[PDB]
Coordinates of C-alpha atoms and ligand atoms in Angstrom, one line a residue:
Chain L
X1 CA 59.8 -25.0 -0.3
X2 CA 56.6 -27.5 0.7
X3 CA 57.3 -28.8 -3.0
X4 CA 56.3 -32.0 -4.2
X5 CA 58.1 -32.7 -6.7
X6 CA 57.1 -36.7 -8.1
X7 CA 59.6 -38.7 -11.4
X8 CA 60.8 -37.5 -13.2
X9 CA 60.5 -40.7 -15.6
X10 CA 63.0 -41.3 -18.8
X11 CA 66.3 -41.1 -19.6
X12 CA 69.5 -39.1 -18.1
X13 CA 70.1 -37.4 -21.1
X14 CA 69.4 -33.7 -22.9
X15 CA 69.6 -31.2 -20.2
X16 CA 67.0 -30.2 -17.2
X17 CA 64.3 -28.3 -17.2
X18 CA 61.8 -27.4 -14.2
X19 CA 59.2 -24.6 -14.8
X20 CA 58.0 -24.5 -11.0
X21 CA 55.1 -24.5 -9.5
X22 CA 51.8 -23.0 -10.6
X23 CA 48.5 -21.1 -9.9
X24 CA 46.4 -22.5 -13.0
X25 CA 48.3 -24.9 -15.3
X26 CA 45.7 -23.5 -18.9
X27 CA 46.7 -25.6 -21.9
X28 CA 49.9 -28.4 -22.0
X29 CA 50.5 -29.6 -25.3
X30 CA 52.2 -32.3 -26.1
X31 CA 53.7 -32.3 -29.5
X32 CA 55.1 -36.1 -30.6
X33 CA 55.9 -38.4 -33.8
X34 CA 57.0 -41.3 -33.3
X35 CA 58.1 -40.8 -29.4
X36 CA 56.9 -37.5 -27.3
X37 CA 58.7 -34.1 -29.1
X38 CA 58.1 -31.8 -26.1
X39 CA 55.8 -30.3 -23.9
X40 CA 54.4 -26.5 -24.1
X41 CA 52.6 -25.4 -20.7
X42 CA 50.7 -22.5 -20.8
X43 CA 50.2 -21.2 -16.8
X44 CA 49.3 -18.4 -14.6
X45 CA 52.4 -17.5 -12.2
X46 CA 51.6 -14.2 -9.5
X47 CA 49.2 -12.4 -11.9
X48 CA 51.5 -13.4 -15.2
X49 CA 50.8 -15.8 -18.2
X50 CA 53.3 -17.2 -19.0
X51 CA 54.0 -20.2 -21.9
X52 CA 57.1 -22.8 -21.6
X53 CA 58.6 -24.4 -24.1
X54 CA 60.3 -28.2 -23.1
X55 CA 62.0 -31.2 -24.6
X56 CA 62.2 -30.4 -29.5
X57 CA 60.7 -28.8 -31.6
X58 CA 59.4 -31.5 -33.6
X59 CA 56.2 -33.4 -34.0
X60 CA 52.4 -32.7 -33.9
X61 CA 50.5 -30.6 -31.5
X62 CA 48.7 -32.3 -28.6
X63 CA 46.3 -29.4 -26.6
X64 CA 44.7 -30.0 -23.8
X65 CA 43.2 -27.1 -23.0
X66 CA 41.9 -27.3 -18.9
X67 CA 38.3 -25.9 -18.4
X68 CA 36.9 -23.4 -15.3
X69 CA 37.6 -26.3 -12.3
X70 CA 39.4 -29.3 -14.8
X71 CA 42.8 -30.2 -13.1
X72 CA 44.8 -32.8 -14.3
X73 CA 44.8 -35.7 -11.9
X74 CA 46.5 -38.4 -13.7
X75 CA 50.0 -38.9 -16.1
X76 CA 50.7 -42.0 -17.8
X77 CA 53.7 -43.2 -20.3
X78 CA 56.3 -45.3 -22.1
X79 CA 59.7 -45.1 -22.1
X80 CA 62.5 -46.8 -23.9
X81 CA 65.4 -46.7 -26.7
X82 CA 64.6 -45.1 -29.2
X83 CA 67.5 -44.9 -31.9
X84 CA 70.2 -44.3 -28.8
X85 CA 68.3 -42.3 -26.8
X86 CA 66.1 -43.2 -23.5
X87 CA 63.5 -40.9 -24.0
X88 CA 59.4 -40.9 -23.2
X89 CA 58.1 -42.3 -26.2
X90 CA 54.2 -42.4 -24.7
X91 CA 52.9 -40.0 -23.1
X92 CA 49.4 -39.3 -21.6
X93 CA 47.1 -37.4 -19.4
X94 CA 43.4 -37.9 -17.2
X95 CA 41.7 -35.0 -16.2
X96 CA 38.7 -34.9 -13.7
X97 CA 36.5 -34.9 -16.6
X98 CA 38.0 -36.6 -19.2
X99 CA 41.4 -38.9 -20.5
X100 CA 43.8 -37.7 -23.1
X101 CA 46.4 -39.6 -25.1
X102 CA 48.3 -41.3 -24.7
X103 CA 50.6 -39.7 -27.5
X104 CA 53.8 -41.0 -29.3
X105 CA 54.1 -44.5 -30.8
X106 CA 57.0 -46.2 -28.9
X107 CA 56.6 -48.8 -26.9
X108 CA 58.9 -49.0 -23.9
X109 CA 58.5 -49.8 -19.8
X110 CA 55.2 -48.2 -18.9
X111 CA 55.2 -45.9 -15.6
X112 CA 51.6 -44.5 -14.8
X113 CA 50.9 -41.9 -11.9
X114 CA 46.8 -42.5 -11.0
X115 CA 46.2 -39.3 -8.1
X116 CA 43.4 -40.2 -5.6
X117 CA 43.7 -37.4 -3.7
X118 CA 45.8 -33.8 -5.2
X119 CA 46.5 -32.6 -9.0
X120 CA 49.6 -31.5 -10.3
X121 CA 50.5 -28.4 -11.0
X122 CA 53.5 -27.8 -13.2
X123 CA 56.2 -30.0 -14.3
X124 CA 60.4 -30.9 -14.2
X125 CA 62.3 -32.8 -16.4
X126 CA 64.9 -33.3 -18.7
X127 CA 65.1 -33.0 -22.9
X128 CA 67.0 -32.8 -26.0
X129 CA 65.9 -33.8 -29.1
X130 CA 62.9 -35.4 -27.2
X131 CA 61.4 -35.6 -24.1
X132 CA 64.2 -37.4 -22.3
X133 CA 61.9 -37.8 -18.6
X134 CA 58.7 -35.6 -17.2
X135 CA 58.1 -35.8 -13.6
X136 CA 55.3 -33.8 -12.1
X137 CA 54.6 -31.1 -9.3
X138 CA 51.4 -31.4 -7.0
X139 CA 49.0 -30.0 -4.9
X140 CA 46.0 -30.3 -3.1
Chain F
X1 CA 46.3 -35.0 1.2
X2 CA 47.9 -36.6 -1.4
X3 CA 47.0 -40.0 -2.3
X4 CA 49.3 -41.6 -5.8
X5 CA 48.3 -44.9 -6.6
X6 CA 46.8 -47.6 -5.7
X7 CA 48.8 -49.7 -7.6
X8 CA 47.5 -52.9 -8.7
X9 CA 44.0 -55.5 -9.0
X10 CA 40.9 -54.7 -7.8
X11 CA 40.7 -58.1 -5.3
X12 CA 40.4 -58.0 -1.4
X13 CA 39.4 -55.1 0.8
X14 CA 41.0 -51.4 1.0
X15 CA 42.8 -50.1 3.4
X16 CA 44.1 -46.9 4.0
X17 CA 46.0 -46.5 7.5
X18 CA 45.9 -42.5 6.6
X19 CA 49.0 -40.1 6.4
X20 CA 51.4 -40.6 10.0
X21 CA 54.0 -38.5 11.7
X22 CA 56.9 -40.4 10.7
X23 CA 57.4 -44.2 9.6
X24 CA 59.3 -46.9 11.6
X25 CA 59.6 -49.2 9.8
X26 CA 58.0 -51.4 6.9
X27 CA 58.3 -55.6 6.8
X28 CA 57.5 -56.7 3.5
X29 CA 56.5 -60.7 3.8
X30 CA 57.0 -62.1 0.5
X31 CA 57.5 -65.1 -1.5
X32 CA 56.3 -65.3 -5.1
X33 CA 53.9 -62.3 -5.0
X34 CA 53.6 -59.9 -2.4
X35 CA 52.3 -60.9 0.4
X36 CA 51.8 -58.1 2.9
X37 CA 52.9 -55.7 4.7
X38 CA 53.3 -54.4 8.7
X39 CA 53.9 -51.0 9.0
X40 CA 54.9 -49.4 12.5
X41 CA 54.2 -45.9 13.4
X42 CA 54.2 -42.8 14.9
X43 CA 50.5 -41.3 15.7
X44 CA 49.9 -38.2 17.9
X45 CA 52.1 -39.4 20.4
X46 CA 51.0 -42.9 19.7
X47 CA 53.2 -45.6 18.1
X48 CA 50.7 -48.5 16.2
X49 CA 51.7 -51.0 13.6
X50 CA 49.0 -52.2 10.8
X51 CA 48.7 -55.6 8.9
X52 CA 48.3 -55.1 5.2
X53 CA 47.6 -58.4 2.9
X54 CA 48.3 -62.3 4.4
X55 CA 50.4 -64.1 6.6
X56 CA 52.6 -66.4 3.7
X57 CA 56.0 -65.0 2.6
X58 CA 58.7 -64.1 4.0
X59 CA 60.0 -60.6 6.1
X60 CA 62.7 -57.9 4.8
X61 CA 61.9 -55.0 7.3
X62 CA 62.8 -51.6 6.2
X63 CA 63.7 -49.9 10.0
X64 CA 64.1 -46.1 8.9
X65 CA 66.9 -44.5 11.0
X66 CA 67.5 -41.0 12.5
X67 CA 66.4 -38.5 9.4
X68 CA 66.2 -41.3 6.9
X69 CA 63.0 -41.2 5.0
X70 CA 60.8 -43.2 2.2
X71 CA 61.8 -41.2 -1.1
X72 CA 61.2 -44.2 -3.7
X73 CA 58.5 -46.9 -4.1
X74 CA 58.4 -49.0 -7.0
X75 CA 57.0 -52.4 -8.1
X76 CA 55.5 -55.4 -10.7
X77 CA 51.9 -56.0 -10.6
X78 CA 50.3 -59.0 -12.7
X79 CA 47.9 -62.6 -13.0
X80 CA 49.2 -65.2 -10.3
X81 CA 47.1 -67.6 -10.4
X82 CA 43.5 -66.1 -11.0
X83 CA 44.3 -62.9 -8.9
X84 CA 45.7 -59.4 -9.4
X85 CA 48.8 -58.6 -7.0
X86 CA 51.7 -57.2 -6.7
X87 CA 54.2 -59.6 -7.6
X88 CA 57.2 -58.0 -6.9
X89 CA 57.4 -54.7 -4.6
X90 CA 60.2 -52.2 -3.3
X91 CA 61.8 -49.1 -1.5
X92 CA 64.5 -45.9 -1.7
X93 CA 65.4 -44.1 1.2
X94 CA 67.3 -41.6 0.7
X95 CA 70.1 -43.2 2.2
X96 CA 69.4 -46.5 0.4
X97 CA 67.2 -48.9 -1.6
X98 CA 65.3 -52.0 -0.6
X99 CA 64.6 -54.9 -2.9
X100 CA 62.9 -55.2 -4.5
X101 CA 61.0 -58.4 -3.2
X102 CA 58.7 -60.8 -5.0
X103 CA 59.5 -63.6 -7.7
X104 CA 56.0 -62.9 -10.3
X105 CA 57.1 -60.4 -12.8
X106 CA 54.9 -57.9 -14.3
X107 CA 53.7 -54.4 -15.4
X108 CA 56.0 -52.7 -14.0
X109 CA 55.1 -49.1 -11.9
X110 CA 57.3 -46.9 -10.1
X111 CA 56.6 -43.7 -7.6
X112 CA 60.8 -41.4 -8.0
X113 CA 60.4 -38.5 -5.3
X114 CA 62.5 -36.0 -5.9
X115 CA 60.8 -34.0 -2.9
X116 CA 58.8 -35.3 -0.4
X117 CA 58.2 -38.7 1.6
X118 CA 56.1 -41.6 1.5
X119 CA 53.7 -40.4 4.8
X120 CA 51.3 -43.7 4.8
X121 CA 49.8 -46.1 3.0
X122 CA 46.7 -47.7 1.2
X123 CA 45.1 -50.3 -1.1
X124 CA 43.9 -53.3 -0.7
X125 CA 44.6 -56.2 0.5
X126 CA 43.6 -60.1 0.9
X127 CA 45.7 -63.2 1.4
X128 CA 48.3 -61.5 -1.0
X129 CA 48.6 -57.5 -1.4
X130 CA 46.3 -56.5 -3.9
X131 CA 47.0 -53.4 -4.5
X132 CA 49.3 -50.4 -3.0
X133 CA 49.5 -46.9 -3.2
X134 CA 50.9 -44.0 -0.9
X135 CA 50.5 -40.8 0.9
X136 CA 52.8 -38.1 0.4
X137 CA 54.4 -35.4 2.7
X138 CA 56.4 -32.3 1.5
Ligands
LIG1 O1 58.9 -37.5 -32.9 C1 59.3 -38.1 -33.5 C2 60.0 -37.9 -35.3 O2 58.5 -39.3 -35.4 C3 58.8 -38.2 -37.4 O3 60.0 -38.5 -38.4 C4 60.7 -40.1 -38.4 C5 62.4 -39.4 -37.3 O4 62.1 -37.8 -36.6 C6 63.1 -39.5 -38.4 O5 63.9 -40.6 -37.5 O6 63.6 -39.3 -39.4 C7 62.4 -40.4 -39.7 C8 62.6 -40.6 -42.0 O7 61.3 -40.8 -42.4 C9 60.7 -40.0 -39.8 O8 60.1 -40.7 -39.8 C10 57.6 -37.5 -37.5 O9 56.6 -37.5 -36.5 C11 58.9 -35.8 -37.0 O10 57.5 -35.0 -36.1 C12 59.0 -36.1 -35.0 O11 60.4 -35.5 -34.7
LIG2 O1 44.3 -61.3 -2.2 C1 44.6 -62.2 -2.9 C2 42.7 -62.6 -2.9 O2 42.0 -63.5 -2.0 C3 41.4 -63.9 -1.9 O3 41.6 -64.8 -3.1 C4 41.6 -66.3 -2.4 C5 42.4 -66.7 -3.4 O4 42.7 -66.6 -4.3 C6 42.3 -68.5 -3.5 O5 42.1 -69.0 -2.4 O6 41.4 -68.5 -4.1 C7 39.6 -68.2 -4.0 C8 39.1 -68.5 -5.2 O7 39.2 -68.5 -6.3 C9 40.0 -66.3 -3.5 O8 38.7 -66.1 -4.1 C10 40.3 -62.6 -1.8 O9 40.6 -61.9 -0.1 C11 40.4 -62.2 -2.7 O10 39.7 -60.8 -2.9 C12 41.5 -61.4 -3.1 O11 42.0 -60.3 -4.6
MAN3 O1 46.8 -40.3 -32.1 C1 47.6 -38.9 -32.1 C2 48.8 -39.1 -33.1 O2 48.7 -38.0 -34.0 C3 50.4 -37.9 -35.0 O3 49.6 -39.5 -35.8 C4 50.8 -38.1 -33.9 O4 51.0 -36.9 -33.6 C5 51.2 -39.0 -32.7 O5 52.0 -38.8 -31.9 C6 50.3 -39.5 -32.0 O6 49.8 -40.2 -31.6
MAN4 O1 66.2 -35.5 -26.5 C1 67.3 -36.7 -26.6 C2 68.6 -36.4 -27.2 O2 68.3 -35.2 -27.7 C3 70.0 -34.5 -27.9 O3 70.8 -35.8 -28.9 C4 70.8 -34.5 -27.3 O4 70.7 -33.2 -26.1 C5 70.8 -36.0 -26.0 O5 71.5 -35.4 -25.2 C6 69.3 -36.4 -25.7 O6 69.2 -37.7 -25.4
MAN5 O1 53.3 -64.6 -2.6 C1 53.0 -66.8 -1.9 C2 53.9 -67.6 -1.3 O2 54.9 -68.4 -1.7 C3 55.8 -69.2 -1.6 O3 54.4 -70.3 -2.4 C4 56.0 -69.3 -0.2 O4 56.4 -68.4 0.1 C5 54.3 -68.7 0.5 O5 54.4 -68.6 1.8 C6 54.1 -67.2 0.0 O6 52.3 -67.5 0.8
MAN6 O1 63.1 -62.1 -4.9 C1 63.0 -61.0 -3.8 C2 62.9 -62.0 -2.2 O2 61.6 -63.4 -2.8 C3 61.5 -63.8 -1.6 O3 60.4 -63.4 -1.1 C4 62.1 -64.7 -0.8 O4 63.1 -65.4 -1.1 C5 63.6 -63.1 -0.2 O5 64.2 -64.1 0.1 C6 64.0 -62.4 -1.3 O6 65.3 -61.4 -1.2
ZN7 ZN1 57.0 -25.2 -28.1
ZN8 ZN1 67.1 -48.3 -34.3
ZN9 ZN1 51.5 -58.7 10.7

């Protein structure tokens, strides 16, 4: 509904997910090991603060807590075959303050989304055992 | 405004066409490398053309038909005899995909647009197209 969605980068495995845009991403938690297992996002939508759980439940958590006036302004990673499956094998974000990651240890086809104007407001993609694919909502 | 990119190097001079009402056509000049781009578009009742990059290469026109929009951009950038330039460049509309054009591989980048469209360009250019980036509209 006026949305701008770029991606998803990755494979066609797993099931579709789409959190829609948020008023405020509070934190992003990337679960990884060899590969990107999953992503938890906690956010406020119309007053309510929710957490959605994407991908699978393996891997080690890596939390990005957004400070007041800190926004996600970049996403990059790599997707490739992980013993049969095209999943996001490395995943990273940058904010207007600091860069995070990349998380994951499997190299593959790089992708990169530098945002010169605007910010990330939400996520979509595909998840199964791991993060098959990830994509992003943009707003000014 | 939503500006994404630019992908490529830091050589050349910065260009910025701003967002347009409607992309009419994109002409991609390439050889070994992406030399340049001509973008024809409408702007507040005026129709305009901008050249970004140099004069080398063979052109490939993407002419946009009725209710056809740019919903994807992809290519590769790399060091080409001393300068980091777009070595391959491609686009997709809602109806079909184009190219990619250029014959020099490098670091890939891809911008699929699930919702929204490309409404304009910015980046860097010299005698080749050093870098390209994109304005996004809903
Ligand atoms: O990120 C994927 C996964 O990586 C690591 O586990 C490996 C695999 O689960 C599988 O191939 O079994 C291996 C046998 O020893 C194991 O290394 C862990 O980091 C895990 O938490 C993660 O889910
Ligand atoms: O667009 C690429 C590049 O063009 C110009 O660079 C010059 C050429 O690469 C060539 O003639 O060799 C010169 C010296 O090695 C070089 O300056 C410039 O516009 C440059 O900024 C740009 O990157
Ligand atoms: O450097 C952070 C690092 O931590 C662990 O070793 C794993 O979770 C990796 O996926 C991650 O890359
Ligand atoms: O997450 C990767 C992988 O996980 C499971 O094995 C299935 O859901 C696959 O469809 C999916 O591609
Ligand atoms: O792309 C760089 C270069 O490639 C080829 O040599 C030709 O097609 C030229 O026109 C072009 O300038
Ligand atoms: O390889 C893509 C593209 O690269 C060059 O610029 C030309 O030779 C084109 O005719 C060709 O289609
Ligand atoms: Zn979770
Ligand atoms: Zn294997
Ligand atoms: Zn021209």
